[PDB]
From a paper:
At the crossroads of these pathways, several partially overlapping enzyme activities collectively known as glutamic-pyruvic acid transaminases (GPTs) or alanine transaminases (EC 2.6.1.2) participate in functions such as alanine de novo biosynthesis, which is essential for the bacterial cell viability (since both L-alanine and its D isomer are building blocks of the cell wall), and alanine degradation, depending on metabolic and environmental conditions. Recently, the alanine transaminases AlaA and AlaC and the valine-pyruvate aminotransferase AvtA (2.6.1.66) have been genetically identified as the three major alanine aminotransferases of the model organism Escherichia coli K-12. Alanine transamination in E. coli is catalyzed by at least eleven distinct transaminases, of which the three predominant enzymes are AlaA, AlaC and AvtA. The reversible transamination of L-alanine to pyruvate is a central metabolic reaction whose relevance is stressed by the large number of enzymes capable of catalyzing this transformation.
Here we describe the 2.11-Å resolution crystal structure of full-length AlaA of E. coli in complex with a substrate-mimicking acetate molecule locked into the active site in the binding pocket of the α-carboxylate group of the incoming substrates, alanine and 2-oxoglutarate. Despite the fact that several crystal structures of alanine transaminases have been deposited in the Protein Data Bank (PDB), the structure of AlaA provides the first glimpse of a completely structured bacterial GPT active site poised for catalysis. In addition to the constellation of electrostatic interactions that secures PLP binding through its phosphate moiety (including the side chains of Ser105, Ser239, Arg248 and Tyr68*, and the backbone amides of Val104 and Ser105), the covalent bond with Lys240 induces a strained conformation in PLP that enhances the reactivity of the cofactor and is further sustained by an extended network of polar and apolar interactions. In accord with the requirements for transaminase activity and control of reaction specificity, the acidic carboxylate group of Asp207 keeps the N1 atom of the pyridinium ring in a protonated state through a salt bridge interaction. Secondly, the crystal structure of AlaA and the other alanine aminotransferases possess an N-terminal segment with two distinct portions, a proximal, generally folded structure that participates in the dimerization interface and stretches over the top surface of the active site; and a distal U-shaped loop that we have termed the plug, 7–10 residues in length, including Tyr15, Ile17 and Arg18, which ends in a rigidly fixed Pro anchor residue followed by a helix.
Residue numbers in the entry:
A (entry chain B): 2 to 405
B (entry chain A): 1 to 404
The structure:
């Protein structure tokens, strides 16, 4: 009598961490070093937490050993409140803010309390794979709207309107975008709002990279651009403040809310179930959002994030058969590859073949629900030396690669 | 502006250790009233401090734990858990069979999500820890409650279990030592539960998070070694025993023949990587807690505060007219029975609410633990004695002239 996985997991595929790592983990155990450009994890690439965060966590640790409120510490939620109040989200109270074990937990919770069987969620393609998985896990269906590579990976508005059904409950916006690195203009975001307003949709805004911007890139939160709509905004400390392991994220409810009291009680229900998010690291939030922002040094010209993005950009375009749109934010690149030139029918196989030959780990584009096997994603976190070595390996790999 | 209700999967979910009565208490606290909250097993506000050996290990390892770790958790942490259960006769367990989550709560939910399809039944004790019922319902499963026998030291009634087994039953939940009854099950009882699970091919889910909080000559028996031929999942953590609930550190261990449940395990691993990882810094405390000297021994012995508080609370609650209670041999709770007809109790939530409004003390009604009748409630034994009598002498005055 076999015990298979539940039906709610039949479509689920969040695997940036998938069966390719099985061979990667094997190579590592054998002693071979594998350059992992697959995960946006700051610490393995030499990114340390700001001292101020570490100091305040250590200081409050003996006082944070018990359960806190399910929504999180008041002072932390107060800091989050003030942060968004300085962006035009004035009516946000501490009761509109939920702190969880990273944004990941809250994304799932937000969908669990919302979706029923048959319900549809508009999700970008390419996506952040958790969003698709979360919707599916919540018994909803992820309907993918296309992002337009020829338009700097901006969402296709005509595609979004065309894929709206009477079952669409909301639309997911990931801005700045993982994995394209796109930074959406205010004009486009205003178009999304109009669509959401006309079709009675809830806007979910994953803005976890809103402070990782390059050059003249300017982040616009969609929440204060939709003051008359109920919107939910996600952000955290993982990427911007390089403390992914502390698991600290939050979601903020903005807009009219009395028509959504039922949904809110569902969220408060899911938060109460697990009692609370981890407490000691919540004391870091106030220090992170307040005072000096250390991320400014990394994204400015000369900063390692800026230079690594530039270096990966130069090398990936100097490869025959590969092009890419330059990221204006976040930590990723989503290069297009001439699938016909290399006879690529399975982009996962290409990733696997590249791993086995050059010991470098990428993520195939279809893992981000891109309909075609002509893309992949690289992370710009590694040192310039590592990026140069891995991309030259990739160039050598592709020069003699004809997928069988 | 159509109404946004909570999802259908949350319609039959409660977990009311935290809710409307709790909501009232906080209002009272805002309003200038000091309230003695005995609703939750939270050690820290009752003068319980983190084992300083745990603190110094987390502090020292904090700068090295900023990034994502393996989804199942830190290797050294899982190493300790493996060895801990190795010593208790589960000699086949490896690191791959261990999942570290943000407290046991997260793992309980995940374990149900990956297992249960719509209509699938899970045997859950009555009374239960309400998260179990919530997690089953949340996963679209049905929580089928088997009664525990108050006249038999709150032991599960084996006849009631067998009478409620249907072809839809997937597994059975065992909370041992028990929340809320504080019962410590015998090896002979646990052995018969194994026999039941063996005949009907049921997965055993063992919540053994109080396995080290024992009184008198009470001996804990893990059901996993007693069922070496069955798949069993055991839950435990640092929250209660090691008084660091706020750190949110728990683990679940898979034991037995796992080949026939490959799909279910793949589901667990999927849910496991969906959130990337559990909070990493506090995972360095597992090795410290599980090894060397156990500080919990000072609290449980006849000199310890937990032993004493358990005593004085049991004797005080029994002397109250119309109230009786079975003495707990473990955990941190009591589940007193009240003579409903004497006070005309038809709703136990209103009773707890009245006691809160009358005397600023917060309890939890028994129906919050899925007990079918309004003739029970729960007391936590964490407060040191001074507040135990205060609140119980308070509870005595309340009942002396109460009529619902
Ligand atoms: C990295 C990432 C997350 C994960 O956030 P956590 O706070 O670490 O859980 C969520 N969404 C996006 C788009 C991400 O890139
Ligand atoms: C307190 C408790 C939990 C929750 O444990 P955490 O690790 O803090 O999430 C789970 N099960 C039982 C029986 C409990 O008493």
């Amino acid at each position: 009598s076999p015990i298979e996985k539940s039906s709610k997991l039949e479509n689920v595929c969040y695997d940036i961490r998938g069966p390719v790592l099985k061979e990667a983990k094997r190579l590592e155990e054998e002693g071979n070093k594998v350059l992992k450009l697959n995960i946006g994890n700051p610490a393995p690439f030499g990114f340390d937490a700001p001292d101020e965060i570490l100091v305040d966590v250590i200081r409050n640790l003996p006082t944070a050993q018990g359960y806190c409120d399910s929504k999180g510490l008041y002072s932390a939620r107060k800091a989050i409140m003030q942060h968004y109040q300085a962006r035009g989200m004035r009516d946000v109270t501490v009761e509109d803010i939920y702190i969880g074990n990273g944004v990941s937990e809250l994304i799932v919770q937000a969908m669990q309390a919302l979706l029923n069987s048959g319900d549809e969620m508009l999700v970008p393609a390419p996506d952040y794979p958790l969003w698709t998985a979360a919707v599916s896990l919540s018994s909803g269906k992820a309907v993918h709207y296309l992002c337009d590579e020829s338009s700097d990976w901006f969402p296709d508005l005509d595609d979004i309107r065309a894929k709206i059904t009477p079952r669409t409950r909301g639309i997911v916006i990931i801005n700045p975008n993982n994995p394209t690195g796109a930074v959406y203009s205010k004009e486009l975001l205003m178009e999304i709002v109009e669509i959401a307003r006309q079709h009675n949709l809830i806007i979910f805004a994953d803005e976890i990279y809103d402070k990782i911007l390059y050059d003249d890139a300017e982040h616009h939160s969609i929440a204060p651009l939709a003051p008359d709509l109920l919107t939910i905004t996600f952000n955290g400390l993982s990427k911007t403040y390089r403390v992914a392991g502390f698991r600290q994220g939050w979601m903020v409810l903005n807009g009219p809310k009395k028509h959504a009291k039922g949904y809110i009680e569902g969220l408060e229900m899911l938060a109460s179930m697990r009692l609370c998010a981890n407490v000691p690291a919540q004391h870091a939030i106030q220090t992170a959002l307040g005072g000096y922002q250390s991320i400014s040094e990394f994204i400015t010209p000369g900063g390692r994030l800026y230079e690594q993005r530039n270096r990966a950009w130069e090398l990936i375009n100097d490869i025959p058969g590969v092009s890419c749109v330059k990221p204006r934010g976040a930590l990723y690149m989503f290069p297009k590859i001439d699938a016909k030139r290399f006879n690529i029918h399975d982009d996962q196989k290409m990733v696997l073949d590249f791993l086995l030959q050059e010991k470098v780990l990428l993520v195939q584009g279809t893992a981000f629900n891109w309909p075609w096997p002509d893309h992949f994603r690289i992370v710009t976190l590694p040192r310039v030396d590592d990026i140069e070595l891995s991309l030259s390996k990739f160039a050598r790999f592709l020069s003699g690669y004809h997928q069988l």
